[PDB]
RNA sequence: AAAACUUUCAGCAACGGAUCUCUUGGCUCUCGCAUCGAUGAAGAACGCAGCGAAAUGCGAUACGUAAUGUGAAUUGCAGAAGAAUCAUCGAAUCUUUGAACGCACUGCGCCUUUGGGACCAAAGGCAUGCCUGUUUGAGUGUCAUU
RNA sequence: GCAGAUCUUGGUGGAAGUAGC
RNA sequence: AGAGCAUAGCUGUUGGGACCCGAAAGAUGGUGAACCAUCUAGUAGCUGGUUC
RNA sequence: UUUCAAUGGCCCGUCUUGAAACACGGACCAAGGAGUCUAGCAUCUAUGCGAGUGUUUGGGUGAUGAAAACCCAUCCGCGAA
RNA sequence: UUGACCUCAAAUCAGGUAGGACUACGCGCUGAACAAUAAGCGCAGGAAAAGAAAAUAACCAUGAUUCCCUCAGUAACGGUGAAGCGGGAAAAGCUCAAAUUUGAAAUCUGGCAACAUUUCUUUUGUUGUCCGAGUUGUAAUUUCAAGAAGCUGCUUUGAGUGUAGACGAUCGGUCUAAGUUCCUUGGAACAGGACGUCAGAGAGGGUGAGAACCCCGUCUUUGGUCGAUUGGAUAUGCCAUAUAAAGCGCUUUCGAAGAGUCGAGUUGUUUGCAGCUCUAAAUGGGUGGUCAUCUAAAGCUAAAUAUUGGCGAGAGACCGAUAGCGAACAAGUAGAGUGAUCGAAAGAUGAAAAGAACUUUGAAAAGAGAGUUAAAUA
């Protein structure tokens, strides 16, 4: 049982081509969703900062975005992560606020029945 | 080699060919007509988003971005939007 | 050598009539070819076989179009009138019923659908 | 240089295509040039050969001697020219074959399909 | 003699006393495809026949298994 | 000692098929795509060409028809002049068999319909399990029921 | 990169016009 | 008052089918004690060979 | 080059045996035919950098094959203690 | 009794569906040698499986799964041999059971009738009615991330039908630059010299020897053009059953949580899994370190990943007829075997067949003259 990496330049170009069709389908929105900033859970890397999965419910409510719409404007949700330190709430709320600063939202046509 | 591959190689039927290989050609843009019109058909999406004033990824680039030329108390506060750096974003 | 466009411009009984005697010279060409034939006749039998196929094709296709017209917009139709793509396709979930959504998921995608956002 | 991945550059595959081609693909492989004054009259460069087309042989032992094309022998890529023959042992004539890209077409056989082909490729009569 | 012609496989390997073909395990439904007989598979698989039907689905997949008459 | 015979070397002719040149083949890697069958698949057998030895192709509409094109060739001959041992292809055709399906496996049937010129023939179907439903009847049912 | 491997494959002799049929 | 790290080569060594050839196998699964196919590149201190 | 004249020279390989003796293998010719491919370790040398070092998991990119080349983000390995 | 309801059957009762084939990748059961190994058996897809924590961890804590790199040949075991961490690819979340709609089974298949609709007279729907299914529970609702209910005051909205254009995707036709000028050798000029031309085209092949300019192509094409077939958006017409339905907010009212399962003893298999013996709980239960985390015994789910098969495609410091496939060809073919199985040898006339007329000898087979060819030393 042996594996060869001859398709390594083939697979990389397939991935790039897979990104370009995604960009074609969804033009204005970025090819990647926003991710939060979290700290690795170990004494070795705890002083580091990296990306998370999504923004917890305290990070959404504090920033001012409901949890239902957040999934629609590209902000992802992590029901499992929680905020134990306020610096973790702060680094990710401002991460949301800077995102909503640059976020153009296209209006959608809405059904308007004659009566009500 | 295989029987199924070999009987139709000897036979007289034409091979079910498909001239599908268009290497190096990118996916043409549908969706937003504005960006399609300002979409360079040759540049990569990281190059075209940048040229159009759009962020391809709000998350950190995991690599080395191209250098073509030799380049020389707050939870209540709100970020007062971001002015568009290009005409096309203003469009 | 007859042509099909004028063959389809008549009723059924004469095509069956025109099929029957065309069979007749087919054996006459056959019985003459086994007792000694010429090159011209050796192709006439080939032409005869091709033309009876043309008659059979014309009459059969009108028979099917008769069934489709007869069974148009009927709930059930004979197994040979139906589609023949692949057994897998005929056992697949139809486009409509694969589009079925619960009223929970209908409310979700009406009030909070995906948007067309963009970043600067 | 070829750039399309739809085309191939293989001696094995291109020869497989050449000698595996059927007649409706061989009718384009057997084309012929046109005489210079006729080439500019219709503004077209080369046209496929056809029976009853008046041509002049340009290469080979039969260079210069003109004629028509009695019948195009597609399965071996040959043109049969009347009066361009060979004396067999038995005194008969086994007409030699000339390839379609050697002769030059002087007078075409004007069919209705040929006229459309001329005007289809930006030409005129 | 101990073998006759098998009506399903067509190879003279149909035992009389056993009433079973050894070349293809007649009259059972599932045929006798033993892995260690690799050379026996390449003798007795698709493409050693004609695949008159399977050569029709291969062609019809290109246009999408469509049906009807042209305009 | 010459011939004969034996021996070496050269010329020439056989024998053999190496070498050299290629090459509609093999192998290897990458790439794109999703498609069999009870609407009878894969497989097998028997057939079929103006004549085929294999070989492909095709199914009594047999080396295929319809349709869309191309526009004059097939070619060892024949053969017609919308030709074509052509292409495309969405329509029909698709022999006996085979999961193989009336019972059997050659034969023997059954049922219904069509008809022949009461009987017979042909056609259609007549395989099992399971699912949803319809009708029919029955259980030693549970009742119901004055 | 061959002289061997009772080496693989093909070819070819003596034996031999012998055993013989 | 640190001298390594990385690439390439050479020779050496340990595994991997392991310079090449050769020991009854055995096991699984089949076919009509026999036979077949694979696992298998099963096993060797030994034998024969290993090229200017 | 063939041949002759004079002088000479025990069949080659293996194995055996100090050595032979041997016993093997060899009818002849052509072609095929056996330290190779790979991971690990250590050594020597060559090169680049040097308290550093290593782009090729991946991303960016590459219009003239685009499986090459070119570029660097976050780690990480081995050193340094 | 009637007749309901329950069971029991049958029917050529209508509508269905299953089987076999392939098997490179994939999911199971099972298995000896030499190791979840071959095999054997079972079941699938364009991927399969897995999957939104009864998951880690002891941190400033992370956060579905899958693959890659490292962690690492490390811990542990006794040479076998990982997992968190980290860094990348990709990302998407969800549906039930447990609630009285109870001021109204609100749900659904089937028959029939019209209306439509189409890759399509071959598809797929709606409306109406009738009958069944169903109260031993079909819809809405809610899934622990919560949520139900009352309240408040802000923000919201189509499972329609066209037309029109733009954009894309797949199939098809189509548009496309220049020497065959002179001289020499040759059977042949594609060669050698000379004079030119084109080039977004000097890839490759053919053509009677090495052809950018004779022919097919190639480049333009990361495209014009003409058709059809569809996809997600935009624009706009019509229709909207909204008395409705959501999000956030506030709560003097609430908050259901999957059993022969977990767990124990015991026995097999290779820690889990399986049989047997027993067999539970409700701040409980599992797992880690009095704490932390998680919430099993029900369900689905893209993409990242695999691919010795199938439909095609492009290449190669690969083999070049004892090689490379067993097969460059009549190749799993002849042929061998009762049988399962086994299984080859075999490429090159020449530019053109011009394949040797004819005379002659011979019963012919063939030979000798003679002919073709550049050459029959083809
Ligand atoms: Zn059989």
């Amino acid at each position: 049982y042996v594996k060869t990496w001859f398709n390594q330049p083939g697979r990389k170009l397939r991935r790039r081509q897979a990104r370009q069709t995604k960009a074609a389908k969804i033009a204005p929105r970025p090819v990647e969703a926003i991710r939060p900033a979290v700290k690795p859970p170990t004494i070795r890397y705890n002083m580091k900062v990296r990306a998370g999965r999504g923004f917890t419910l305290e990070e959404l409510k504090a920033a001012g975005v409901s949890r239902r719409v957040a999934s629609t404007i590209g902000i992802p949700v992590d029901h499992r992560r929680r905020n134990r330190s306020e610096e973790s709430l702060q680094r990710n709320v401002e991460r949301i606020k800077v995102y909503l600063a640059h976020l153009i939202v296209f209006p959608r046509k809405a059904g308007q029945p004659k009566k009500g | 080699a295989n029987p199924r591959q070999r009987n139709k190689q000897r036979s007289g039927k034409p091979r079910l060919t498909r001239r599908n290989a268009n290497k190096k050609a990118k996916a043409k843009i549908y969706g937003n007509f504005v960006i399609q019109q300002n979409w360079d058909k040759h540049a990569t999406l990281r190059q075209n988003y940048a040229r159009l004033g759009l962020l391809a990824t709000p998350n950190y680039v995991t690599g080395g971005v191209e250098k073509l030329y030799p380049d020389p108390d707050v939870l209540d506060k709100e970020i007062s939007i971001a002015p568009a750096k290009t005409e096309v974003v203003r469009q | 050598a007859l042509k099909t466009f004028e063959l389809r411009k008549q009723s059924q009984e004469n095509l069956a009539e025109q099929l029957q005697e065309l069979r007749q010279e087919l054996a006459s060409l056959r019985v003459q070819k086994i007792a000694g034939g010429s090159g011209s006749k050796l192709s006439k039998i080939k032409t005869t076989r091709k033309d009876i196929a043309r008659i059979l094709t014309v009459i059969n296709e009108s028979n099917r179009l008769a069934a489709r017209e007869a069974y148009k917009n009927k709930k059930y139709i004979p197994l040979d009138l139906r589609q023949k793509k692949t057994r897998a396709i005929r056992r697949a979930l139809t486009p409509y019923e694969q589009s079925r959504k619960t009223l929970k998921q209908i409310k979700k995608e009406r009030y909070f659908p995906l948007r067309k956002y963009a970043l600067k | 240089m070829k750039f399309s991945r739809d085309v191939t550059s293989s001696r094995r595959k291109q020869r497989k295509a050449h000698f595996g081609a059927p007649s409706s693909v061989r009718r384009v492989l057997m084309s012929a040039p046109l005489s210079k004054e006729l080439r500019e009259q219709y503004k077209i460069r080369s046209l496929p050969v056809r029976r009853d087309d008046q041509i002049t042989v340009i290469r080979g032992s039969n260079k210069g001697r003109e004629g028509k094309i009695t019948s195009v022998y597609r399965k071996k890529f040959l043109l049969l020219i009347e009066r361009v023959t060979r004396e067999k042992a038995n005194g008969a004539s086994a007409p030699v074959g000339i390839d379609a890209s050697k002769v030059v077409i002087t007078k075409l056989h004007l069919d209705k399909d040929r006229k459309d082909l001329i005007v289809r490729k930006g030409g005129k009569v | 003699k101990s073998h006759t012609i098998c009506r399903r496989c067509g190879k003279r390997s149909f035992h009389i006393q056993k009433s079973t073909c050894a070349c293809c395990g007649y009259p059972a439904a599932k045929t006798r495809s033993y892995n260690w007989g690799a050379k026996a598979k390449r003798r007795r698989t698709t493409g050693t026949g004609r695949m008159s039907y399977l050569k029709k689905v291969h062609r019809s997949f290109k246009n999408g298994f469509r049906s009807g008459k042209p305009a």
Side-chain angles (χ1 to χ4, degrees), chain E residues 6-11 13-14 21-26:
Chain E
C6 176
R7 292 176 192 155
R8 163 170 98 210
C9 73
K11 182 101 190 218
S13 305
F14 196 48
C21 178
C23 166
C24 67
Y26 203 64

PDB file of all heavy atoms in Angstrom, chain E residues 6-11 13-14 21-26, ligand 1:
ATOM      1  N   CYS E   6     -24.775 -25.969 -22.142  1.00  0.00           N
ATOM      2  CA  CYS E   6     -25.567 -25.217 -21.181  1.00  0.00           C
ATOM      3  C   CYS E   6     -26.342 -24.141 -21.927  1.00  0.00           C
ATOM      4  O   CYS E   6     -25.792 -23.443 -22.784  1.00  0.00           O
ATOM      5  CB  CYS E   6     -24.679 -24.596 -20.101  1.00  0.00           C
ATOM      6  SG  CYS E   6     -25.539 -23.547 -18.905  1.00  0.00           S
ATOM      7  N   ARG E   7     -27.632 -24.029 -21.613  1.00  0.00           N
ATOM      8  CA  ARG E   7     -28.505 -23.147 -22.375  1.00  0.00           C
ATOM      9  C   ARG E   7     -28.266 -21.676 -22.059  1.00  0.00           C
ATOM     10  O   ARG E   7     -28.623 -20.812 -22.864  1.00  0.00           O
ATOM     11  CB  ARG E   7     -29.966 -23.520 -22.120  1.00  0.00           C
ATOM     12  CG  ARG E   7     -30.363 -24.876 -22.687  1.00  0.00           C
ATOM     13  CD  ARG E   7     -31.791 -25.230 -22.309  1.00  0.00           C
ATOM     14  NE  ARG E   7     -32.114 -26.625 -22.589  1.00  0.00           N
ATOM     15  CZ  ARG E   7     -33.053 -27.316 -21.957  1.00  0.00           C
ATOM     16  NH1 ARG E   7     -33.786 -26.771 -20.999  1.00  0.00           N
ATOM     17  NH2 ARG E   7     -33.259 -28.586 -22.289  1.00  0.00           N
ATOM     18  N   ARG E   8     -27.645 -21.390 -20.919  1.00  0.00           N
ATOM     19  CA  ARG E   8     -27.422 -20.005 -20.505  1.00  0.00           C
ATOM     20  C   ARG E   8     -26.016 -19.516 -20.819  1.00  0.00           C
ATOM     21  O   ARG E   8     -25.841 -18.388 -21.281  1.00  0.00           O
ATOM     22  CB  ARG E   8     -27.697 -19.881 -19.003  1.00  0.00           C
ATOM     23  CG  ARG E   8     -27.144 -18.629 -18.352  1.00  0.00           C
ATOM     24  CD  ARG E   8     -27.672 -18.484 -16.936  1.00  0.00           C
ATOM     25  NE  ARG E   8     -26.725 -18.983 -15.944  1.00  0.00           N
ATOM     26  CZ  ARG E   8     -27.080 -19.515 -14.779  1.00  0.00           C
ATOM     27  NH1 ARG E   8     -28.362 -19.621 -14.460  1.00  0.00           N
ATOM     28  NH2 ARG E   8     -26.153 -19.942 -13.932  1.00  0.00           N
ATOM     29  N   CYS E   9     -25.013 -20.351 -20.574  1.00  0.00           N
ATOM     30  CA  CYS E   9     -23.624 -19.974 -20.802  1.00  0.00           C
ATOM     31  C   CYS E   9     -23.146 -20.315 -22.204  1.00  0.00           C
ATOM     32  O   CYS E   9     -22.253 -19.641 -22.724  1.00  0.00           O
ATOM     33  CB  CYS E   9     -22.702 -20.670 -19.801  1.00  0.00           C
ATOM     34  SG  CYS E   9     -22.501 -22.418 -20.132  1.00  0.00           S
ATOM     35  N   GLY E  10     -23.695 -21.361 -22.813  1.00  0.00           N
ATOM     36  CA  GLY E  10     -23.315 -21.746 -24.152  1.00  0.00           C
ATOM     37  C   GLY E  10     -22.030 -22.535 -24.273  1.00  0.00           C
ATOM     38  O   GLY E  10     -21.623 -22.848 -25.397  1.00  0.00           O
ATOM     39  N   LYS E  11     -21.376 -22.867 -23.165  1.00  0.00           N
ATOM     40  CA  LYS E  11     -20.153 -23.656 -23.178  1.00  0.00           C
ATOM     41  C   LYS E  11     -20.468 -25.055 -22.672  1.00  0.00           C
ATOM     42  O   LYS E  11     -21.192 -25.211 -21.685  1.00  0.00           O
ATOM     43  CB  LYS E  11     -19.070 -23.003 -22.316  1.00  0.00           C
ATOM     44  CG  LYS E  11     -17.742 -23.736 -22.321  1.00  0.00           C
ATOM     45  CD  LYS E  11     -16.735 -23.072 -23.250  1.00  0.00           C
ATOM     46  CE  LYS E  11     -15.506 -23.942 -23.443  1.00  0.00           C
ATOM     47  NZ  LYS E  11     -14.251 -23.148 -23.504  1.00  0.00           N
ATOM     48  N   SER E  13     -20.333 -27.467 -20.636  1.00  0.00           N
ATOM     49  CA  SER E  13     -19.887 -27.788 -19.287  1.00  0.00           C
ATOM     50  C   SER E  13     -21.047 -28.161 -18.371  1.00  0.00           C
ATOM     51  O   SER E  13     -20.930 -28.009 -17.151  1.00  0.00           O
ATOM     52  CB  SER E  13     -19.115 -26.619 -18.674  1.00  0.00           C
ATOM     53  OG  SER E  13     -18.045 -26.226 -19.512  1.00  0.00           O
ATOM     54  N   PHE E  14     -22.162 -28.637 -18.919  1.00  0.00           N
ATOM     55  CA  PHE E  14     -23.351 -28.932 -18.129  1.00  0.00           C
ATOM     56  C   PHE E  14     -23.317 -30.395 -17.703  1.00  0.00           C
ATOM     57  O   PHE E  14     -23.540 -31.294 -18.521  1.00  0.00           O
ATOM     58  CB  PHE E  14     -24.615 -28.618 -18.925  1.00  0.00           C
ATOM     59  CG  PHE E  14     -25.850 -28.524 -18.084  1.00  0.00           C
ATOM     60  CD1 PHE E  14     -25.853 -27.771 -16.923  1.00  0.00           C
ATOM     61  CD2 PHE E  14     -27.009 -29.180 -18.452  1.00  0.00           C
ATOM     62  CE1 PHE E  14     -26.983 -27.678 -16.145  1.00  0.00           C
ATOM     63  CE2 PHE E  14     -28.145 -29.089 -17.677  1.00  0.00           C
ATOM     64  CZ  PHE E  14     -28.131 -28.336 -16.521  1.00  0.00           C
ATOM     65  N   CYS E  21     -24.078 -26.790 -14.501  1.00  0.00           N
ATOM     66  CA  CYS E  21     -22.949 -26.333 -15.295  1.00  0.00           C
ATOM     67  C   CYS E  21     -21.846 -25.816 -14.380  1.00  0.00           C
ATOM     68  O   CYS E  21     -22.112 -25.142 -13.381  1.00  0.00           O
ATOM     69  CB  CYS E  21     -23.382 -25.241 -16.273  1.00  0.00           C
ATOM     70  SG  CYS E  21     -22.040 -24.585 -17.263  1.00  0.00           S
ATOM     71  N   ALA E  22     -20.603 -26.160 -14.712  1.00  0.00           N
ATOM     72  CA  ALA E  22     -19.459 -25.690 -13.942  1.00  0.00           C
ATOM     73  C   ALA E  22     -18.905 -24.372 -14.464  1.00  0.00           C
ATOM     74  O   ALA E  22     -18.293 -23.621 -13.698  1.00  0.00           O
ATOM     75  CB  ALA E  22     -18.352 -26.747 -13.938  1.00  0.00           C
ATOM     76  N   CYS E  23     -19.106 -24.077 -15.750  1.00  0.00           N
ATOM     77  CA  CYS E  23     -18.589 -22.836 -16.318  1.00  0.00           C
ATOM     78  C   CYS E  23     -19.339 -21.624 -15.781  1.00  0.00           C
ATOM     79  O   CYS E  23     -18.779 -20.525 -15.708  1.00  0.00           O
ATOM     80  CB  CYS E  23     -18.665 -22.885 -17.845  1.00  0.00           C
ATOM     81  SG  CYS E  23     -18.452 -21.297 -18.672  1.00  0.00           S
ATOM     82  N   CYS E  24     -20.617 -21.792 -15.428  1.00  0.00           N
ATOM     83  CA  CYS E  24     -21.399 -20.663 -14.942  1.00  0.00           C
ATOM     84  C   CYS E  24     -22.401 -21.019 -13.855  1.00  0.00           C
ATOM     85  O   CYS E  24     -23.345 -20.253 -13.649  1.00  0.00           O
ATOM     86  CB  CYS E  24     -22.137 -19.973 -16.092  1.00  0.00           C
ATOM     87  SG  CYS E  24     -23.431 -20.951 -16.863  1.00  0.00           S
ATOM     88  N   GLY E  25     -22.263 -22.154 -13.180  1.00  0.00           N
ATOM     89  CA  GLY E  25     -23.134 -22.424 -12.052  1.00  0.00           C
ATOM     90  C   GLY E  25     -24.606 -22.460 -12.389  1.00  0.00           C
ATOM     91  O   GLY E  25     -25.429 -22.023 -11.582  1.00  0.00           O
ATOM     92  N   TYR E  26     -24.960 -22.947 -13.575  1.00  0.00           N
ATOM     93  CA  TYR E  26     -26.356 -23.195 -13.894  1.00  0.00           C
ATOM     94  C   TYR E  26     -26.916 -24.227 -12.914  1.00  0.00           C
ATOM     95  O   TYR E  26     -26.176 -25.078 -12.413  1.00  0.00           O
ATOM     96  CB  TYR E  26     -26.479 -23.709 -15.328  1.00  0.00           C
ATOM     97  CG  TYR E  26     -27.821 -23.507 -16.003  1.00  0.00           C
ATOM     98  CD1 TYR E  26     -28.323 -22.240 -16.263  1.00  0.00           C
ATOM     99  CD2 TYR E  26     -28.595 -24.600 -16.367  1.00  0.00           C
ATOM    100  CE1 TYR E  26     -29.559 -22.074 -16.891  1.00  0.00           C
ATOM    101  CE2 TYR E  26     -29.823 -24.443 -16.984  1.00  0.00           C
ATOM    102  CZ  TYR E  26     -30.302 -23.186 -17.243  1.00  0.00           C
ATOM    103  OH  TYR E  26     -31.526 -23.050 -17.855  1.00  0.00           O
TER     104      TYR E  26
HETATM  105 ZN1  LIG K   1     -23.451 -22.933 -18.097  1.00  0.00          ZN
END
